[PDB]
């Protein structure tokens with residue numbers, strides 16, 4: 001095979017440094033084509049003799065004099081003549097065939113001139129269009145991750161092939177140019193046309209291609225100079241800056257960077273930090289070294305209209321991206337198969353960095369609902385996959401893209417947190433420092449971190465492990481899934497088995513370990529911490545730590561630091577329940593949530609009866625804290641989805657109304673009649689969920705609150721009296737109770753909304769009407785770009801479908817309008833998969849299955865496109881629902897009847 | 902954007 005037909009680069013040539021000059025043209029040509037021009041020189045060293053240069057190039061046209069490149073020797077080195085240059089599209093290469101061989105130890109410079117489309121494709125060097133008044137603005141920006149640096153200039157575009165970069169931007173003289181590094185000095189006029197300026201940037205450190213960035217825009221900044229001279233700037237649209245929306249990001253950045261410099265035992269490795277808010281950046285955020293990009297909703301914050309969960313999103317997303325400025329950027333994983341270590345690490349430490357900026361919020365707890373239980377839903381499937389993938393199976397750009405999923409990020413985070421916990425943070429930080437210092441400006445595999453952590457373990461006598469760090473972590477990284485740990489408290493016997501939600505599933509992926517793990521197990525007995533225990537790679541063991549007396553109780557996995565779920569014999573469950581009903585504060589709040597999370601999953605897997613899971617919600621009438629209530633609500637939304645059109649619903653409603661009333665009443669006093677929010681984040685979250693649960697289950701005191709506040713708003717439109725935290729519930733319930741006066745008022749507010757997040761809440765609340773006619777009229781609007789944006793059409797139809805009354809209307813509308821498929825699957829995506837999922841989510845009967853089959857019977861032309869598999873998934877999900885309702889209906893009805901009084 | 906929602 002020829003090397004230019006292989007996806008991995010040769011190792012014969014390694015880059016030293018690059019000069020790259022880019023010039024975006026932000027005015028289109030005659031035909032509406034936007035382009036950029038560039039010029040580059042790469043200096044590389046020959047390691048082994050070769051008569052071919054292979055370098056990456058994607059969607060670039062070459063205008064170099066002669067062949068596509070010019071090739072020179074550095075210093076007094078001679079250079080072979082070029083035979084020919086060709087582009088090989090499949091493997092994204094520019095190939096320079098030479099008439100003789102390059103020589104080991106010699107350096108060469110390769111110069112090229114090129115151009116590409118400055119497309120609106122969020123890839124490489126690209127354009128982004130947005131509105132300022134009647135005016136349409138266009139800026140130029142970059143997204144290299146993973147394999148798109150090559151789409152902006154020819155480069156050895158693999159993460160381990162690091163080099164220094166000298167970037168220059170040629171741009172309109174009234175626009176600002178930003179890159180990884182500071183400008184060298186003031187811009188100078190382009191001599192051939194002084195309407196353009198030339199901005200040169202300081203040389204980057206040795207770094208990876210995927211982390212480069214350069215941006216040309218009208219943006220402005222808010223700034224601060226940290227004590228060590230590091231300049232910090234938040235960049236955004238002029239009007240966003242003037243509004244003060246960059247201030248929260250600016251406030252937290254300084255503390256976050258200080259936290260990480262200390263955590264990592266390493267100085268921030270750059271002279272400045274720019275972070276930029278881009279309108280509609282669909283990738284969310286990108287950790288470009290010294291110039292981190294974000295979508296606006298992720299970086300900007302409007303105190304007057306934004307909720308607290310909004311603030312939580314800003315501080316954690318910043319902490320995540322800043323974490324990479326060391327872990328990922330300074331020390332880079334050598335290949336994409338180890339992506340999980342980079343993203344998993346940042347996904348864990350984002351909570352630590354954010355906790356430093358907001359220390360009263362207990363943010364570290366949020367990893368449990370946010371990543372652990374979230375990823376366990378997909379890792380408890382037969383179709384999961386290990387964190388680890390062999391390097392040689394990850395080759396194409398598409399294979400690289402598949403590394404970026406829930407397992408890599410959320411299981412990565414969970415497993416790393418588990419590791420830090422069983423090591424202790426102090427020891428983990430020691431190894432982490434050692435790793436960063438040894439590999440700074442270089443590349444690694446996950447085995448290198450384990451080695452440095454082992455060095456830390458071996459240098460102390462306190463923490464003793466049952467095996468090497470690598471052998472333990474291999475159990476968590478080389479095989480998919482996680483165990484359920486089951487304890488028999490009468491004997492103290494403990495067992496582990498691979499946990500699958502579907503007790504009838506066939507696992508066909510084989511494990512080198514037979515799905516046995518080495519498991520760290522903390523425990524608490526009658527509210528007192530016990531000695532730590534390790535379950536070895538055995539199915540079964542026994543320890544007196546897990547043996548109780550019938551008045552005692554024991555609980556495993558404190559704070560769910562371990563990546564596993566726990567089951568007990570029935571008597572121990574009842575003892576835990578008794579404790580939660582008589583003095584809950586003895587069980588850590590995270591474990592009060594765990595009991596609910598785990599037991600609903602166990603009931604799904606048929607390991608406990610569903611009534612045991614429901615019994616675990618009974619303590620909630622005395623619960624004031626956020627997480628355990630959130631656990632219940634996440635675990636019951638499926639119950640509500642299946643039963644909200646059945647005789648089960650009244651009793652379920654009555655049951656939830658009874659559980660939530662004391663909490664609603666608690667906050668009524670605490671908030672001084674809803675006039676002031678709880679102080680800390682968790683309590684604000686608890687209040688939000690309490691109002692939401694109250695209103696949606698028909699608590700009269702909540703309905704009355706919603707009506708009063710919305711009435712008050714309608715009588716004084718410019719002064720919204722509803723705190724951002726409570727808007728989504730208050731808006732929804734007031735519209736549900738009301739009619740066309742409320743609906744028309746909210747529609748008018750939607751059409752003048754300036755802020756995306758406010759517009760979203762309104763769009764969602766409008767779907768809460770209980771008038772069939774209003775919902776059909778609304779559906780009719782969803783396909784009009786004048787009234788409802790394209791990108792919002794399917795969300796809106798979905799919100800309507802989630803209304804019990806809107807369910808038939810949306811389903812009818814989708815079936816009947818399906819042929820908006822020969823109109824919306826050609827110019828722009830239009831997520832069809834999410835629409836199918838959304839409107840079919842409820843289906844739980846044979847009759848509904850028939851309709852979905854009957855409907856599918858229209859493959860005869862049309863097809864489905866982006867949602868072809870989504871439809872198949874809807875048929876399989878409906879069958880699973882049919883079977884679940886049949887097994888569960890009778891038992892669940894009687895439980896709710898029995899416990900609603 | 903990379904954080905991790907609950």
Ligand SMILES: *[C@@H]1O[C@H](CO)[C@@H](O[C@@H]2O[C@H](CO)[C@@H](O)[C@H](O)[C@H]2NC(C)=O)[C@H](O)[C@H]1NC(C)=O
Pocket residue numbers: 017018019041042043164165166203
């Ligand atoms: C990018 O700019 C840097 C820094 O100015 C250049 O580094 C110089 O390179 C030469 C080797 O050609 C060294 O002798 C000098 O000592 C370097 N200066 C410094 C400050 O390191 C670098 O060569 C440039 N890259 C390219 C491709 O030209």
Ligand SMILES: *[C@@H]1O[C@H](CO)[C@@H](O[C@@H]2O[C@H](CO)[C@@H](O)[C@H](O)[C@H]2NC(C)=O)[C@H](O)[C@H]1NC(C)=O
Pocket residue numbers: 019041109166
């Ligand atoms: C890469 O760019 C740098 C900076 O423009 C070039 O170095 C400059 O070379 C000019 C002559 O063209 C001199 O005025 C300066 O001595 C250089 N400036 C600095 C900061 O070193 C460099 O020659 C370019 N690299 C290559 C291989 O052409």
Ligand SMILES: *[C@@H]1O[C@H](CO)[C@@H](O[C@@H]2O[C@H](CO)[C@@H](O)[C@H](O)[C@H]2NC(C)=O)[C@H](O)[C@H]1NC(C)=O
Pocket residue numbers: 027135174175218
């Ligand atoms: C930068 O200069 C450009 C070119 O004059 C300005 O772009 C024009 O701006 C007005 C808006 O008042 C439009 O009517 C023209 O269509 C724009 N021309 C182009 C080619 O886009 C721009 O306003 C100036 N921006 C700043 C920040 O000074």
Ligand SMILES: *[C@@H]1O[C@H](CO)[C@@H](O[C@@H]2O[C@H](CO)[C@@H](O)[C@H](O)[C@H]2NC(C)=O)[C@H](O)[C@H]1NC(C)=O
Pocket residue numbers: 014160161162334439442443444
């Ligand atoms: C990827 O990283 C490895 C280190 O893990 C680099 O290998 C080292 O190169 C440095 C020079 O900076 C030498 O000091 C070390 O002796 C090497 N250590 C080894 C081999 O363990 C390697 O250079 C990197 N790969 C590339 C292409 O740069």
Ligand SMILES: *[C@@H]1O[C@H](CO)[C@@H](O[C@@H]2O[C@H](CO)[C@@H](O)[C@H](O)[C@H]2NC(C)=O)[C@H](O)[C@H]1NC(C)=O
Pocket residue numbers: 362365529558559588589590
């Ligand atoms: C389990 O998690 C809780 C927090 O949810 C831990 O309690 C925190 O402990 C640290 C250090 O003592 C304090 O800074 C916090 O103020 C505590 N928060 C609360 C709400 O009490 C607790 O230490 C963890 N349990 C174990 C065994 O590690």
Ligand SMILES: *[C@@H]1O[C@H](CO)[C@@H](O)[C@H](O)[C@H]1NC(C)=O
Pocket residue numbers: 035036061115116117
């Ligand atoms: C690249 O060249 C092709 C073929 O000549 C042409 O269709 C395309 O527009 C060119 N693109 C740019 C950005 O110049």
Ligand SMILES: *[C@@H]1O[C@H](CO)[C@@H](O)[C@H](O)[C@H]1NC(C)=O
Pocket residue numbers: 247248251301303
């Ligand atoms: C930023 O910090 C200042 C000073 O502490 C504070 O007044 C302001 O409320 C903060 N801004 C935001 C949006 O939190």
Ligand SMILES: *[C@@H]1O[C@H](CO)[C@@H](O)[C@H](O)[C@H]1NC(C)=O
Pocket residue numbers: 261262264265266267
């Ligand atoms: C790294 O940690 C050591 C040990 O506490 C300390 O003396 C040193 O100041 C630290 N260096 C940095 C850059 O944090």
Ligand SMILES: *[C@@H]1O[C@H](CO)[C@@H](O)[C@H](O)[C@H]1NC(C)=O
Pocket residue numbers: 488491493542
């Ligand atoms: C507990 O394990 C012991 C030792 O293997 C065994 O004799 C016993 O049957 C187990 N009992 C239960 C109830 O699991």
Ligand SMILES: *[C@@H]1O[C@H](CO)[C@@H](O)[C@H](O)[C@H]1NC(C)=O
Pocket residue numbers: 582583585586
């Ligand atoms: C509940 O437990 C905590 C911790 O032991 C203790 O402070 C308190 O006295 C207990 N309260 C009641 C009412 O049992």
Ligand SMILES: [Zn+2]
Pocket residue numbers: 287320321324342343346347903
């Ligand atoms: Zn990340």
